């Protein structure tokens, strides 16, 4: 019974880690989107980078 409980908790925790990694560690290394929840507009970045550096200073 001690083996049963310990191995059940261990397998359960691995299953929880798969859901946890998707929401925390895996997303923490690379986000699906920036904090703005938008895709990067590459044409806007080329002109905006100059505008935002002076406007945010």
């Amino acid at each position: 019974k001690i083996i049963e409980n310990a191995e059940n908790e261990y397998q359960t925790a691995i299953s929880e880690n798969y859901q946890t990694m998707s929401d925390t560690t895996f997303k923490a290394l690379r986000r699906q989107l920036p904090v703005t929840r938008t895709k990067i507009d590459w044409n806007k970045i080329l002109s905006y980078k100059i505008g935002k550096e002076m406007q945010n200073a």
């Binding site: 703005t36 929840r37 406007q55 945010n56």
Partner: protein, 182 residues
């Protein structure tokens, strides 16, 4: 290339006009056209069928007030164009529209057709050197001196809240309601 760009805040209630570098808008007048309702019988009377700003404030009883723009949407462009013509008159600023560039501040989540028609007027009627349309929310933070922050702007025409991160407005979190000062 030009001397100094003119900032024009197209507010629903009052139009705020001045030059970039000015601490306060030098010329602020109500955004409506007043036309005389009563008949002219005697000579040497008030000339003109159009009165805007302090001339309409002093003789308000004579005039019928019509607002060209409701909830930040221009219903009558003929009146709105005449008001922008008054911005460059001898009363306000008193400069050539072709000489100075213009910065206009529009409400968020407006139709594209408004910006397209607005642009046509200042490039065709006024032959402006350059035009830059700006959001109300982003400018409010630049003034306050914060790059990140939620702007709860409850205007005369519309009320809206824009969450802005590092000078960037989150287009999906913007919430605007028609209910305003009017």
């Amino acid at each position: 290339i030009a001397n100094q760009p003119v900032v024009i805040d197209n507010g629903s209630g009052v139009i705020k006009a001045g030059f970039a570098g000015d601490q306060i808008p030098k010329y602020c007048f109500p955004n409506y056209v007043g036309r005389p309702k009563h008949v002219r019988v005697m000579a040497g009377a008030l000339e003109g069928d159009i009165f805007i700003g302090p001339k309409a404030e002093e003789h308000r009883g004579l005039l019928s007030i019509r607002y060209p723009m409701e909830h930040g949407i221009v219903k009558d462009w003929n009146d709105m164009e005449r008001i922008w013509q008054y911005v460059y008159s001898k009363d306000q600023l008193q400069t050539f529209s072709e000489e100075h560039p213009v910065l206009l501040t529009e409400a968020p989540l407006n139709p594209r057709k408004n910006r397209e028609r607005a642009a046509e007027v200042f490039f065709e009627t006024f032959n402006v050197p350059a035009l830059f349309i700006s959001m109300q929310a982003v400018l409010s933070l630049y003034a306050t001196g914060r790059t990140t922050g939620v702007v709860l702007d409850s205007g005369d025409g519309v009320t809206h809240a824009v969450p802005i991160y590092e000078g960037f407005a989150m287009p999906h979190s913007i919430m605007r309601i028609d209910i305003a000062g009017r």
